[PDB]
Every structure is written in C-alpha cells, then in structure tokens.
Coordinates of C-alpha atoms (C1' of nucleotides) in Angstrom, one line a residue:
Chain A
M1 CA 30.3 -155.1 77.7
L2 CA 28.6 -155.2 74.2
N3 CA 30.6 -156.6 71.4
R4 CA 29.2 -158.2 68.4
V5 CA 30.5 -159.1 64.6
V6 CA 29.0 -160.4 61.9
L7 CA 30.9 -160.6 58.4
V8 CA 30.1 -162.4 55.1
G9 CA 33.2 -163.1 52.8
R10 CA 35.0 -165.4 50.5
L11 CA 37.8 -167.4 52.2
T12 CA 41.1 -166.3 50.7
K13 CA 43.1 -169.6 51.1
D14 CA 42.1 -173.0 52.5
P15 CA 41.4 -173.2 56.3
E16 CA 44.0 -173.7 58.4
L17 CA 43.4 -176.5 61.2
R18 CA 45.8 -177.0 63.9
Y19 CA 45.2 -178.6 67.4
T20 CA 46.4 -177.2 70.7
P21 CA 48.5 -179.4 73.3
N22 CA 45.7 -180.5 75.1
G23 CA 43.5 -181.1 71.8
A24 CA 41.5 -178.1 71.2
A25 CA 40.9 -177.7 67.5
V26 CA 41.9 -174.2 65.9
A27 CA 40.5 -173.1 62.6
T28 CA 41.7 -170.0 61.0
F29 CA 40.8 -168.2 57.6
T30 CA 40.5 -164.8 56.2
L31 CA 37.4 -163.8 54.8
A32 CA 37.6 -161.0 52.1
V33 CA 34.4 -158.7 52.6
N34 CA 33.2 -156.7 49.6
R35 CA 33.6 -153.2 50.2
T36 CA 30.0 -150.9 49.6
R37 CA 35.7 -152.9 44.1
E38 CA 38.3 -153.2 46.8
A39 CA 37.8 -155.5 50.0
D40 CA 38.7 -156.0 53.4
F41 CA 41.0 -158.6 54.5
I42 CA 39.6 -159.8 58.2
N43 CA 41.3 -162.7 59.9
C44 CA 38.9 -165.0 61.8
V45 CA 39.8 -168.0 64.5
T46 CA 37.0 -171.0 65.3
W47 CA 37.5 -173.4 67.8
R48 CA 36.5 -176.9 69.1
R49 CA 33.5 -178.7 66.8
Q50 CA 33.1 -175.3 65.0
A51 CA 36.8 -175.2 63.9
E52 CA 36.7 -179.2 62.8
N53 CA 33.4 -178.2 60.7
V54 CA 34.9 -175.2 59.1
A55 CA 38.0 -177.7 57.9
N56 CA 35.6 -180.4 56.3
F57 CA 33.5 -177.8 54.5
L58 CA 35.3 -174.5 53.7
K59 CA 38.2 -174.1 51.1
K60 CA 39.7 -171.0 49.0
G61 CA 37.0 -168.9 47.7
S62 CA 34.1 -170.5 49.8
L63 CA 31.4 -167.9 50.7
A64 CA 30.7 -168.3 54.5
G65 CA 29.4 -165.7 57.2
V66 CA 30.7 -165.4 60.5
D67 CA 29.3 -164.0 63.9
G68 CA 31.6 -163.3 66.6
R69 CA 33.2 -160.9 68.8
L70 CA 36.3 -158.2 68.2
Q71 CA 39.7 -159.6 69.9
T72 CA 43.0 -157.8 70.1
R73 CA 46.4 -158.9 71.3
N74 CA 49.7 -157.9 71.6
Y75 CA 52.6 -159.2 69.5
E76 CA 56.4 -158.5 68.9
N77 CA 57.5 -159.1 65.3
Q78 CA 61.2 -159.9 64.2
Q79 CA 61.7 -156.5 63.6
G80 CA 60.9 -155.4 67.1
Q81 CA 58.2 -153.2 66.5
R82 CA 55.2 -154.0 69.0
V83 CA 52.1 -154.8 66.4
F84 CA 48.5 -154.8 67.3
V85 CA 46.4 -157.7 66.2
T86 CA 42.5 -157.8 65.8
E87 CA 40.6 -160.9 64.8
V88 CA 37.1 -162.2 64.8
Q89 CA 36.4 -164.9 67.6
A90 CA 33.6 -166.5 65.3
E91 CA 31.3 -168.3 67.5
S92 CA 28.8 -169.3 64.7
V93 CA 30.0 -170.2 61.0
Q94 CA 27.1 -170.2 58.2
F95 CA 28.0 -172.1 54.9
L96 CA 26.5 -169.9 52.2
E97 CA 28.1 -172.2 49.5
Chain B
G1 CA 30.9 -157.6 42.3
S2 CA 28.5 -156.5 44.6
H3 CA 28.9 -155.7 48.5
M4 CA 28.8 -158.3 51.4
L5 CA 27.5 -157.9 55.0
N6 CA 29.9 -156.3 57.2
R7 CA 28.4 -155.1 60.7
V8 CA 29.8 -154.1 64.2
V9 CA 28.6 -153.0 67.5
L10 CA 30.5 -152.0 70.1
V11 CA 30.4 -150.6 74.0
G12 CA 33.3 -149.2 75.7
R13 CA 35.1 -146.7 77.1
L14 CA 37.4 -144.2 75.5
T15 CA 41.3 -145.0 76.8
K16 CA 42.1 -141.4 75.8
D17 CA 40.5 -138.5 75.1
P18 CA 39.4 -138.3 71.0
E19 CA 41.4 -136.7 68.4
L20 CA 39.9 -134.5 66.0
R21 CA 41.9 -133.4 62.8
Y22 CA 40.5 -132.0 59.5
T23 CA 41.6 -134.1 56.1
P24 CA 43.2 -132.2 53.4
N25 CA 40.0 -132.8 51.2
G26 CA 38.2 -130.8 54.1
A27 CA 36.4 -133.4 56.1
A28 CA 36.6 -134.1 59.8
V29 CA 37.8 -137.1 61.4
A30 CA 37.8 -138.1 65.0
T31 CA 39.8 -141.4 66.2
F32 CA 39.5 -143.0 69.6
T33 CA 40.4 -146.5 71.1
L34 CA 37.2 -148.0 72.9
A35 CA 38.6 -150.6 75.9
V36 CA 35.4 -152.9 75.8
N37 CA 35.5 -155.5 78.5
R38 CA 36.0 -159.4 78.0
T39 CA 33.3 -162.0 79.4
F40 CA 36.0 -164.1 81.0
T41 CA 39.2 -163.9 83.2
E42 CA 40.7 -158.2 80.7
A43 CA 39.5 -156.3 77.5
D44 CA 40.1 -155.5 74.1
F45 CA 41.1 -152.3 72.7
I46 CA 39.2 -151.7 69.2
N47 CA 40.2 -148.2 66.8
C48 CA 37.2 -146.6 65.8
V49 CA 37.1 -143.7 63.4
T50 CA 34.1 -141.6 62.4
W51 CA 33.5 -138.8 60.3
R52 CA 32.2 -134.9 59.5
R53 CA 29.2 -134.0 61.9
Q54 CA 29.5 -137.2 64.0
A55 CA 33.3 -136.5 64.4
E56 CA 32.8 -132.9 65.5
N57 CA 30.2 -134.0 68.2
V58 CA 32.4 -136.9 69.3
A59 CA 35.5 -134.3 70.1
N60 CA 32.9 -131.9 72.1
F61 CA 31.1 -134.6 74.2
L62 CA 33.6 -137.6 74.9
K63 CA 36.5 -137.5 77.0
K64 CA 39.1 -140.2 78.4
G65 CA 37.1 -142.7 80.4
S66 CA 33.6 -142.0 78.4
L67 CA 31.4 -144.8 78.1
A68 CA 30.2 -145.2 74.3
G69 CA 28.9 -147.2 71.9
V70 CA 29.6 -147.6 68.2
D71 CA 27.8 -149.2 65.4
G72 CA 29.7 -149.2 61.9
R73 CA 31.6 -151.6 59.6
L74 CA 35.1 -153.2 60.2
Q75 CA 37.4 -151.8 57.3
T76 CA 41.6 -152.5 57.0
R77 CA 43.5 -149.9 56.2
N78 CA 47.3 -150.0 54.7
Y79 CA 50.1 -147.8 54.6
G80 CA 56.0 -146.6 61.9
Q81 CA 56.5 -147.3 58.1
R82 CA 54.2 -150.3 57.0
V83 CA 51.1 -150.6 59.4
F84 CA 48.4 -152.9 58.9
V85 CA 45.4 -151.0 60.7
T86 CA 41.9 -152.7 61.6
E87 CA 39.5 -150.1 62.6
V88 CA 35.9 -149.7 62.8
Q89 CA 34.3 -147.2 60.6
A90 CA 31.6 -145.6 62.7
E91 CA 28.3 -144.6 61.3
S92 CA 26.6 -143.8 64.5
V93 CA 28.1 -143.0 67.8
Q94 CA 25.9 -143.0 70.9
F95 CA 26.6 -140.9 74.2
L96 CA 26.2 -143.2 77.3
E97 CA 26.5 -140.0 79.8
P98 CA 24.1 -138.9 82.3
Chain C
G1 CA 17.4 -177.1 60.2
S2 CA 20.9 -176.0 59.2
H3 CA 21.0 -172.7 61.3
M4 CA 21.4 -169.1 60.0
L5 CA 22.9 -165.6 60.9
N6 CA 20.5 -164.0 63.5
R7 CA 21.6 -161.3 65.7
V8 CA 20.0 -158.1 67.0
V9 CA 21.4 -155.6 69.6
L10 CA 19.8 -152.6 71.2
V11 CA 19.8 -150.1 73.8
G12 CA 16.7 -148.6 75.2
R13 CA 14.9 -147.7 78.3
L14 CA 12.4 -150.1 79.8
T15 CA 8.9 -149.2 79.5
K16 CA 7.9 -150.5 83.0
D17 CA 9.3 -152.9 85.4
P18 CA 10.5 -156.4 84.2
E19 CA 7.8 -159.1 84.8
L20 CA 9.4 -162.2 86.3
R21 CA 7.5 -165.5 85.6
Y22 CA 8.5 -169.1 86.3
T23 CA 8.2 -172.0 84.1
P24 CA 6.1 -175.1 85.2
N25 CA 9.6 -177.0 85.8
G26 CA 10.9 -174.0 87.7
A27 CA 12.7 -172.0 85.4
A28 CA 13.3 -168.3 85.8
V29 CA 12.1 -166.2 82.7
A30 CA 11.9 -162.2 83.0
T31 CA 10.5 -159.9 80.0
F32 CA 10.4 -156.3 79.3
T33 CA 10.1 -154.0 76.7
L34 CA 12.6 -151.3 75.6
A35 CA 12.0 -148.0 74.0
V36 CA 14.9 -147.3 71.5
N37 CA 14.3 -143.8 70.6
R38 CA 14.7 -142.9 66.9
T39 CA 14.8 -139.3 68.0
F40 CA 14.9 -136.8 70.9
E41 CA 9.1 -141.0 68.2
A42 CA 10.6 -144.5 69.2
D43 CA 10.4 -147.9 68.9
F44 CA 9.1 -150.4 71.6
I45 CA 10.5 -153.7 71.1
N46 CA 10.0 -156.9 73.5
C47 CA 12.6 -158.9 75.0
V48 CA 13.2 -162.0 77.0
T49 CA 15.6 -163.5 79.1
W50 CA 15.9 -166.8 81.0
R51 CA 17.6 -168.5 83.8
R52 CA 20.6 -166.3 85.6
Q53 CA 20.0 -163.5 83.0
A54 CA 16.2 -163.1 84.3
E55 CA 16.9 -163.4 87.8
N56 CA 19.4 -160.1 87.4
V57 CA 16.9 -158.0 84.7
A58 CA 14.5 -158.5 87.8
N59 CA 16.9 -157.4 90.5
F60 CA 18.7 -154.7 89.0
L61 CA 16.5 -153.2 86.2
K62 CA 13.3 -150.8 86.7
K63 CA 11.2 -148.6 84.9
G64 CA 13.2 -146.0 82.7
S65 CA 16.6 -148.1 83.3
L66 CA 19.3 -147.7 80.1
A67 CA 20.1 -151.5 79.3
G68 CA 21.8 -153.2 76.2
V69 CA 20.3 -156.4 74.8
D70 CA 22.1 -159.1 72.3
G71 CA 20.5 -162.1 71.1
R72 CA 18.3 -163.4 68.4
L73 CA 15.0 -162.2 67.3
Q74 CA 12.4 -164.8 67.4
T75 CA 8.3 -165.2 67.1
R76 CA 6.0 -166.7 69.6
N77 CA 2.7 -168.1 69.8
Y78 CA 0.4 -167.5 72.7
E79 CA -3.2 -166.8 74.0
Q80 CA -4.8 -162.3 74.8
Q81 CA -8.1 -162.7 76.6
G82 CA -9.3 -164.8 73.5
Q83 CA -7.4 -165.6 70.3
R84 CA -4.0 -166.3 69.9
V85 CA -1.2 -163.6 69.2
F86 CA 2.0 -164.0 66.9
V87 CA 4.5 -161.6 68.5
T88 CA 7.9 -161.2 67.6
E89 CA 10.7 -160.9 70.4
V90 CA 14.3 -160.4 71.1
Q91 CA 15.5 -163.5 73.1
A92 CA 18.2 -161.6 75.1
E93 CA 21.4 -163.9 75.2
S94 CA 23.1 -161.0 76.9
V95 CA 22.1 -158.2 79.0
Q96 CA 24.4 -155.3 79.9
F97 CA 23.2 -152.9 82.8
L98 CA 23.9 -149.2 82.0
Chain D
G1 CA 16.8 -140.1 63.0
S2 CA 18.0 -143.7 64.2
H3 CA 19.7 -142.1 67.4
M4 CA 19.9 -144.7 70.0
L5 CA 21.9 -147.8 69.2
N6 CA 19.9 -150.5 66.9
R7 CA 20.7 -153.1 64.5
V8 CA 19.5 -156.5 63.1
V9 CA 21.3 -159.0 60.8
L10 CA 19.4 -161.6 59.0
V11 CA 19.9 -164.4 56.6
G12 CA 16.8 -166.9 55.7
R13 CA 14.8 -167.9 52.9
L14 CA 11.8 -165.9 51.1
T15 CA 8.3 -167.6 52.2
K16 CA 6.5 -165.6 49.3
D17 CA 7.2 -163.9 46.3
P18 CA 8.4 -160.1 46.9
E19 CA 5.5 -157.5 46.8
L20 CA 6.4 -154.1 45.2
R21 CA 4.2 -150.9 45.5
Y22 CA 4.7 -147.5 45.0
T23 CA 4.0 -144.5 47.6
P24 CA 2.4 -141.2 47.4
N25 CA 5.8 -139.9 46.2
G26 CA 6.2 -142.9 43.8
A27 CA 9.2 -144.2 45.8
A28 CA 9.7 -147.9 45.4
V29 CA 8.7 -150.0 48.5
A30 CA 9.3 -153.7 48.6
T31 CA 7.9 -156.2 51.3
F32 CA 8.9 -159.7 51.9
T33 CA 8.9 -162.4 54.6
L34 CA 11.9 -164.2 55.7
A35 CA 12.0 -167.8 56.9
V36 CA 15.1 -167.8 59.6
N37 CA 16.1 -171.3 60.9
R38 CA 16.6 -172.3 64.3
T39 CA 19.5 -174.3 65.6
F40 CA 17.5 -177.2 67.5
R41 CA 8.9 -174.3 66.1
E42 CA 12.1 -174.6 63.7
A43 CA 12.2 -171.4 61.8
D44 CA 11.0 -167.5 62.1
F45 CA 9.0 -165.7 60.3
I46 CA 10.6 -162.1 59.7
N47 CA 9.0 -159.4 57.9
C48 CA 11.5 -157.1 56.2
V49 CA 11.0 -153.6 54.2
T50 CA 13.5 -151.7 51.9
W51 CA 13.0 -148.7 49.9
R52 CA 14.3 -147.0 46.8
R53 CA 16.6 -148.7 44.3
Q54 CA 17.6 -151.5 47.0
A55 CA 13.5 -152.5 46.3
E56 CA 13.7 -152.2 42.7
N57 CA 16.5 -155.0 42.7
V58 CA 14.7 -157.0 45.7
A59 CA 11.3 -157.2 42.9
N60 CA 14.0 -158.1 40.0
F61 CA 16.3 -160.7 41.3
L62 CA 14.7 -162.1 44.4
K63 CA 12.0 -164.8 44.1
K64 CA 10.4 -167.3 46.7
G65 CA 12.9 -169.6 48.1
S66 CA 16.0 -167.4 47.3
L67 CA 18.6 -166.8 50.2
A68 CA 18.8 -162.9 51.2
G69 CA 20.6 -161.5 53.7
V70 CA 19.3 -158.3 55.2
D71 CA 21.3 -155.4 57.2
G72 CA 18.7 -153.0 59.1
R73 CA 17.0 -151.5 62.0
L74 CA 13.7 -152.7 64.2
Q75 CA 10.6 -150.7 63.9
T76 CA 7.7 -151.4 65.5
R77 CA 4.0 -150.6 64.5
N78 CA 0.5 -150.6 66.2
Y79 CA -2.8 -150.8 64.3
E80 CA -6.2 -151.9 64.7
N81 CA -7.6 -154.7 63.0
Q82 CA -11.4 -155.4 61.7
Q83 CA -12.0 -157.3 65.1
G84 CA -11.4 -154.0 67.2
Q85 CA -8.2 -155.2 68.7
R86 CA -5.0 -153.1 68.9
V87 CA -2.2 -155.7 66.8
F88 CA 1.5 -155.1 68.0
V89 CA 3.8 -155.7 64.5
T90 CA 7.9 -155.5 64.4
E91 CA 9.6 -155.8 61.1
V92 CA 13.0 -155.3 60.0
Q93 CA 13.5 -151.9 57.9
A94 CA 16.3 -153.6 55.5
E95 CA 18.8 -151.0 54.7
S96 CA 21.4 -153.0 53.1
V97 CA 20.4 -156.7 51.1
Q98 CA 22.8 -159.4 50.1
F99 CA 21.7 -161.7 47.4
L100 CA 23.3 -165.2 47.9
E101 CA 21.9 -167.8 45.6
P102 CA 23.7 -169.2 42.8
Chain E
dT1 C1' 0.6 -150.3 77.0
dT2 C1' 4.9 -147.6 76.6
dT3 C1' 11.4 -144.8 78.1
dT4 C1' 14.0 -139.7 79.5
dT5 C1' 25.0 -135.4 69.1
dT6 C1' 20.9 -135.4 64.0
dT7 C1' 18.2 -129.3 59.5
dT8 C1' 18.6 -128.2 53.1
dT9 C1' 22.4 -130.1 48.5
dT10 C1' 18.5 -125.4 46.6
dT11 C1' 15.0 -125.4 39.2

DNA sequence: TTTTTTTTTTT
C-alpha cells in the first residue's frame, strides 16, 4: 500500500547515532518543519550508510529534507499508559545546508 | 520565517467508522485511522483529520474497512492527560470504492 | 551529482493495456499511461516500470484498471517516425493494484 | 478539481531566469525550469508553473542557479507545433514554493 | 492516443 512522506525542516539537536547489536547504524533526529509562526516537530529514523552520513554532516539547526514512510509502534511508559509513536523512516536525506 | 515543505500521501483501510463532530467555532471535523500495510514481514496505523465539506463527505461515504487515500500535511498536536498527537491534516480524501 | 528530492504519487486509470517490451540484455520493461481525473478533464501521465514490477503490470493490469504509482519524475529521449522526442515520464518504483 | 490523487515534490536548480507574464485577467504567472540531479543523463529538466502572489515572489527572489523546492501537481498538455506534429508536454503546477539559497 | 465527494464570499 502507498505510504510516502517528504519533509524539509531544521534539526532541533545534533543527530544521535548508535549501533544495533549486529552493527547496523541508527541515526535519529527531529525536524522542526515550519507551518504554513509555529512549527511541527517530527521524529525521523535513518539506517546503515544514510545514518552514518547524517552523523558526519548534520547538527543542531542544519537544514535538511527527508523522504520516507510513516511508521507506528506501541510503547508503554513508566506512567503505565500505552503510547502511540509515529516516526518517519527516512530512506533518503538531502543536505540543504 | 517562511513556510517549509510538508507532504504526506497514504492509501489504507479504515480501522473504525469515521467519527464526525462539529467544532465549537462551527467547523466540521472528521477523524479516522488508516491501516496502511507494511512492505515486509504488518501494518501502520496513521491518524487522519479532515475538515469542513471533506469531513461531511467522509462520514457519508466511508465506513470501517473502506479503502481510501489521503493527501495532506503532517502536524503534531499537543494537549488521558498529556497526549502528543501526530496526525495527517488531510486536504484531499479519495474514495477507492466500486 | 548529489541527489535531490524527486517524488511522485498518482492514482489513475490506464488509457490502454500496458505494452511489454524487453531490453536487448533481457530486462522486462512495461509502460502505460494513467488518466488522473481532475474532475468527473483529466491528465494523462506516462509511467514506466522494470524487472518484476513490469511483469506484474503486464499480468494484472488492462485498460481502465485503477492503479497507484510511486516513483521519480525523469525525462527521456527516443526517436517518433523521424525526429527525436523529449518526454517526461514517471519511473514507477512501486505500483499498487486496486 | 484535483479529485483523484496527484502530488509532486521536487528540489532542483533553475536552469534559466524565471519568466513572468500576465494573463488576460492580469494575474501573475511565473514559468521556470528545474535541474533535478540523479543519483548515478545525470539530471532531469522539469518545467514548473506558479500563479498569483506565489509567482511574484519567484520573479523577485529566484534567479538562474537558485535552489528551489516546489510542491504541486502533474498537468499534461498537447499542442501542434509548426512542423504539424502533435507534441505532448508534462509540467508541474507548483502550488507551494520554498526558497533555499543563503 | 487516451480511463470510468467538488458550486458563490456577492459593489
């Protein structure tokens, strides 16, 4: 089924890079997309080489554009309430700089 | 400063039947959840929101299990005590019925 | 050549059956034109698909079939019965059958 | 109309300076061309169109070589040239435009 | 070369 997202925002913090147990790179960051002035804070996830590149070139405030899909996943917080997360599985990231 | 790109396009089935209510300011608002299938081994559940006439059409022609595609922007709302809502503000809703 | 954002998504009906060709090296390529209605006027976009996706288009899509495409927007050069033409097509990375 | 689903998002460089004309109604119309790079022909030439205030800002802010991001629809066209052959044209109806240069 | 839900904003 069709599922496509395209965003252009500024990173709110430095991209946070980590590695899975079996070595897969995982870069995460939060784009602040200006509204059509407030903005929306969307969370994005990157994998493998695209994640390592996000780490070496993006930082707080950098302008960037993502292209991916919307994901959801259940979560149980310390307060007990079940939370719904929505992320952007960015398959491509353009550095606008 | 100025605006920034923000576009979303989904095609999924409604988990429930769309719920229509009228805003205190008089505007119509219909909500519904699309279940778009994942491309691998099973589905994501995106919250959609549409307004005014597009909302009145959704409530009349879409029900649970209906296939539909939306075209809007991704916005994060904030307000069961403190919920961080991530939803699609649907500007268009296409009915994929017979 | 650093990459840039290039995304297209459409839902339309084939103007005719998809024509299946084969690359000199043996790759499957299927083309078709989608009629994306503005109203019930329409736009007629040309789409190309490759490898397994061209196989499925050829097997599961005929004229008037509702289909969704997701891909890039690329230009192309070829010859019709004379001078060259400069077309703009949609490289369907994924095609949903409806 | 824009009833069935149809959306385009592009980011490219202007190949030529924008062209601003005015329609019978006196409304603003801006036409420009983007060079959308490939990821290993190495770029794609896409024609764009915008209207009204969105077209005024294009002619003022954007010049040849500027980096721009458009969001709109696909719209087709067919005309007969002087050679007597029916040409077919696709171009983006840029609803939204974002300026990206420094 | 074409396929088969939407309306005004009113001097």
